[PDB]
Design a protein around this ligand. Structure first.
Ligand SMILES: CNCCC[C@]12CC[C@H](c3ccccc31)c1ccccc12
Ligand SMILES: CNCCC[C@]12CC[C@H](c3ccccc31)c1ccccc12
Ligand SMILES: [Cl-]
Ligand SMILES: [Cl-]
Ligand code: NA
Ligand code: NA
Lengths: 565, 565
């Protein structure tokens, strides 16, 4: 038979795509970036690159998943030369998990630390926190002053518990000496992969069943946190500072460059996750309304998450006597630095901390389930043997992720967690989707894509989407790729500086995913027999239409195909 | 078809079974252990445990390979319950290579260093050697004194070049801080695996073609080295010290146990290598004469290698004015410490050094080819899919060995090379051969084994072999296992105290191979349907004789089977 597995409960697909859209990025990247770019001057470019990019790629991916009901790697049965591109979106799907699951363990250790009456991030001292030699200072009892940002000030109790209490960074000095993997983090990383295996072994049914909770919990958590925080003193400061009427902070090195990255990273369009989640769906399904609703809910959730984050920041600035400029933070780990301390500052800190940490666990587990579904599903469709042994392939993928995420849970965990995040999703996931858009628009045609969409739902997409898919979106992706490649800085942590070979290793990891396109192109060209004008016809023409290759009448070789809008 | 691949040239099988036994062990273990256990009082226990063990296991393995023409794992088609034991002899076959190939790279770097007019081990100084500020001392220019053994004296030029010049141990502090893998060793470890892949991809033909040289070279090398060394002043000292008329150093402890492990480690009997090299052989082949000749050549080669080693040691003691007690050496690396320096002490050091290093390279390549061939043949005869794609499976095995031997080529390479060597072949390979002998003698029967041997050649083995296979060899193996388990000392590499978790990791690595027997027994018991008295019949009875299982007439359940000699 065929693994259709259509969602009997229609709400399952919507909840799944919403969960895949809303992740920790919407929590910790949107608020800081919005203020750093201007606040009110960040929402307009966000909406601009949200209607010219994202939503177009989201619609394209949904249509490719529904019409071409197949896997992520095998979605290119209409353009075999770009099939290797699918492999890329699988590898990028794995490397990211190598650190992403670790970010879930960091959300579990704290969750285990929150089952107490006194929280460790409240005050200094050995409370599962390793204090330094008189360096940790109690800000509540010491009003002397501060000379660094709260993200850069590694002497606060919360930052101390994050660096030494959880990660144990005090016994690591770089990637050259990583040390031994922490066992308290190994248990928290093993429970996560066990849950992922037990939730992704039967198929998409249990996946949607777990999504039903892991997606609905964070919205309620954020709503309750906003209701509690808006009344706290300081929220009016942070909300009105990050959202100001005179939001004019635009330069050429600003929102027009930075909003281009957050959109793609927060939406999730252009990935095997959407191709898989749309393959297990009915053929006559409206995906335009889904493409609009998912992106709108994603943007509204990012907006309210920034609201809550800056309310927390304003409360912290009104309680620690610091200015809003110093409350702006950077780095990968931020939901663990400022938010647990702010929860501790309020009464009943245990309940709010447990709720926030179970929200972060639900979000992380849902995102990891999506990422591992992009791998387990989409690769089995290529190798028919893996389809029947789905439990075994799921176990193998989970065990490989567990055994290859040990470098990110070591003593220098953040030193091997800011290296994969920077290169795996930094540039590879951009060239991959650029090649995808090119193969879909210029090689498969936008008119044929529109006809397929009309056969799916019943209406042909307007000229706007047809022009954005071939002209606007590919140019946008190429521009972002050029900006990422040319404007490249050496990877450096808050204070640590990576050795020169670290950049080489990161670029090699990026190339491992990026060069999958030309390698597979050469493989397909050499593995086929015929003339030089016939091997080209195998790779730019649909498989199910290969019978027309003998007829010598191919639409692609005509001029009307490339100039169709 | 069937991959018979019988040795058309009969000399190929002999060279393969002989070269596989003669390796670096026969070079660096037999001489020191012989003198430590008595010298002339060590040849007698050697011959004793060479006729009650080894030769019996060698004959058994050759007969199992010739009669049961299959792989190492699937040689148990007559006793399925012990088939998992085969898996052990595969895994132990891989872990060893993880360090063994590294020992080949150490024989290549020196080989590349010997293409000069002045050798680096001659005198101190930066000559591809990293010395200390004032630790290295010129023995020719400084006759002050010495207070440590030449093995542990890390201030000699050759020892300095071995520790810091090649391995770069100065920038390592143990297994907790291994550092980055050395590239000068990475290239030498990659060339070796490339040669292994290009020599083991076609099959056993190119394997025998390469063995034709890699086995014939070391004998000529040792012969020329002995001819050159016997005339040097000092050889009469070392030869007469390690071989003395009053050789009486007898002790109840550590005099018969050391030979018991050295015989097994230097012969190779009881391994998938013999089962593989005998599977690709004619059915009507004399293996008794082969089992005798291979072991005799192995012992004679070990004897002459000890002769040459102690000739070199006596020359060094007569030249450096040290006593023979201080020239006795320990540790894994010895052919690189004393032998290159002794070659340097003679005129024309470049030629003798190149010859000795190409001999070491030939021996290492032969051993690695034998091990990888055993692995590939076992995993191919177990999984029929891997038989046709032999090139791809060979490439995968070589690439996995290259990517998993990077811990042994690091700055602290000898710290990850004395851990696998101690636990992989220390105890697991002994319990494996114990289970093999038990399943062959008590479960398959020695009378049936003798009948199979008679069907192979034409004569039934005598009562001596039939009694040693069931009584002497299993008791010997159990005694060696008990001594290795009870008399266990923590790993100490030149007074370096390994952390407590190192012993746990080593025992876990040993268990990964050892527990393959009960796990597979439970798997076979649960994976079969029937009564409790019928599931036992599937696993202790031959597969091709399973038709008798339904007939309720099984020889194993009778008393005459267990009491047959
Ligand atoms: C909006 N994105 C949220 C999901 C994060 C995600 C989804 C697939 C893969 C991945 C690659 C690039 C970017 C983001 C991801 C991944 C693997 C494991 C966990 C999470 C992921
Ligand atoms: C006396 N014969 C020496 C061969 C050394 C050998 C043969 C199989 C495996 C192995 C296990 C235990 C002991 C010795 C070995 C191995 C893998 C790679 C290189 C060499 C080996
Ligand atoms: Cl977003
Ligand atoms: Cl020997
Ligand atoms: Na999510
Ligand atoms: Na050898």
């Amino acid at each position: 038979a065929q693994p259709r597995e259509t969602w009997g409960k229609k709400i399952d697909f919507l909840l799944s795509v919403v969960g895949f859209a809303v992740d920790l990025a919407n929590v910790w990247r949107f608020p800081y970036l919005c203020y750093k770019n201007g606040g009110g001057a960040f929402l307009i470019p966000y909406t601009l690159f949200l209607i010219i990019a994202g939503m177009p790629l989201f619609y394209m991916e949904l249509a490719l998943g529904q019409y071409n009901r197949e896997g992520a790697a095998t979605v290119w049965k209409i353009c075999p030369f770009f099939k290797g591109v699918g492999y890329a979106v699988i590898l990028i799907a794995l490397y990211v998990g190598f650190y992403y699951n670790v970010i879930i363990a960091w959300s579990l250790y704290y969750l285990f630390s929150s089952f107490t009456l006194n929280l460790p991030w409240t005050d200094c001292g050995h409370t599962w926190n390793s204090p330094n030699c008189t360096d940790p200072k109690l800000l509540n009892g010491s009003v002397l002053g501060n000379h660094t940002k709260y993200s850069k000030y590694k002497f606060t109790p919360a930052a101390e518990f994050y660096e030494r209490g959880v990660l144990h960074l005090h016994e690591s000095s770089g990637i050259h000496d990583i040390g031994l993997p922490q066992w308290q983090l190994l248990l928290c990383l093993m429970v996560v992969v066990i849950v992922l295996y037990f939730s992704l072994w039967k198929g998409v049914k249990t996946s949607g069943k777990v999504v039903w909770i892991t997606a609905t919990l964070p919205y309620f958590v954020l709503f309750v946190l906003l209701v509690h925080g808006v009344t706290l003193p300081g929220a009016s400061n942070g909300i009105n500072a990050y959202l100001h009427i005179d939001f004019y902070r635009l330069k050429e090195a600003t929102v027009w460059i930075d909003a281009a990255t957050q959109i793609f990273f927060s939406l999730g369009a252009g990935f095997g996750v959407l191709i898989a989640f749309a393959s297990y769906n009915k053929f006559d399904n409206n995906c335009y309304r889904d493409a609009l609703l998912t992106s709108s809910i994603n943007c509204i959730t990012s907006f309210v998450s920034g609201f809550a984050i800056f309310s927390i920041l304003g409360y912290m600035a009104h309680e620690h006597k610091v200015n809003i400029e110093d409350v702006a933070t950077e780095g990968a780990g931020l939901v663990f630095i400022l938010y647990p301390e702010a929860i501790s500052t309020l009464s009943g800190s245990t309940f709010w901390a447990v709720v926030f940490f179970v929200m972060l666990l639900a979000l992380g587990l849902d995102s990891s389930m999506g990422g591992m579904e992009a791998v387990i599903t989409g690769l089995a469709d290529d190798f028919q043997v893996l389809k029947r042994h789905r439990k075994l392939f799921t176990f193998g993928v989970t065990f490989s992720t567990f055994l290859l995420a040990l470098f990110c849970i070591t003593k220098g965990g953040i030193y091997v967690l800011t290296l994969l995040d920077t290169f795996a999703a930094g540039t590879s996931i951009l060239f991959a989707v650029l090649m995808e858009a090119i193969g879909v628009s210029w090689f498969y045609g936008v008119d044929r894509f529109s006809n397929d969409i009309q056969q799916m739902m019943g209406f042909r997409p307007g000229l706007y989407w047809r022009l954005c898919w071939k002209f606007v979106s590919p140019a946008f992706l190429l521009f972002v790729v050029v900006v990422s490649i040319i404007n490249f800085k050496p990877l450096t942590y808050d204070d640590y500086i990576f050795p020169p070979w670290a950049n080489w290793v990161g670029w090699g990891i990026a190339l491992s995913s990026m060069v999958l396109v030309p390698i597979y192109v050469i493989y397909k060209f050499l593995s086929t027999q015929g003339s030089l004008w016939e091997r080209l016809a195998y790779g730019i023409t649909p498989e199910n239409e290969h019978h027309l290759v003998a007829q010598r009448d191919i639409r692609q070789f005509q001029l009307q195909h490339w100039l169709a809008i």
